[PDB]
């Protein structure tokens, strides 16, 4: 459902399976080779699955989150 938008490392994560998010709420943060980019929910929903973890490597179009309302 939600995906990373820049090359980097998933500095922090703020979602869990079964958690709730709302469009524009902070769900992760990128470090990007010493740059800083908040990662916010592309759409509201209940989280079904987190496709990465805090500290994982990530890239533009790499998966981040899967939502029950979007994986019906
Ligand atoms: C350089 O590679 C050393 C570690 C860089 C960590 C970076 S600096 C910008 C981001 N903010 C932060 O606290 N950590 C990330």
Curated annotation (Swiss-Prot):
Domain annotation Biotinyl-binding: ranges: 1-68
SUPFAM superfamilies: Single hybrid motif
Record keywords: Biotin, Lipoyl
Induction line: Detected in log-phase B.subtilis cells (at protein level).
Modified residues (N6-lipoyllysine): 34
PROSITE patterns per UniProt: BIOTINYL_LIPOYL
Domain of life the protein comes from: Bacteria
Keyword match Nucleus: no
Post-translational modification: Can be both biotinylated and lipoylated on Lys-34 upon overexpression in E.coli depending on the growth medium; the nature of the modification in situ in B.subtilis is unknown.
The keyword ATP-binding is annotated on this UniProt entry: no
UniProt-listed Gene3D superfamilies: 2.40.50.100
One Pfam family per UniProt: Biotin_lipoyl
Residue numbers carrying N6-biotinyllysine: 34
NCBIfam families, sorted: PRK05889.1, PRK08225.1
Protein's name according to its UniProt entry: Biotin/lipoyl attachment protein
Encoding gene (name): yngHB
């Amino acid at each position: 459902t939600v995906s990373i938008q820049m090359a980097g490392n998933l500095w922090k994560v703020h979602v869990k399976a079964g958690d709730q998010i709302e469009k524009g709420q902070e769900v992760a943060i990128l470090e990007s080779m010493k740059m800083e980019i908040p990662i916010v929910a592309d759409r509201s929903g209940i989280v079904k699955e987190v496709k990465k973890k805090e500290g994982d490597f990530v890239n533009e179009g790499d998966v981040l989150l899967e939502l029950s309302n979007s994986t019906q």
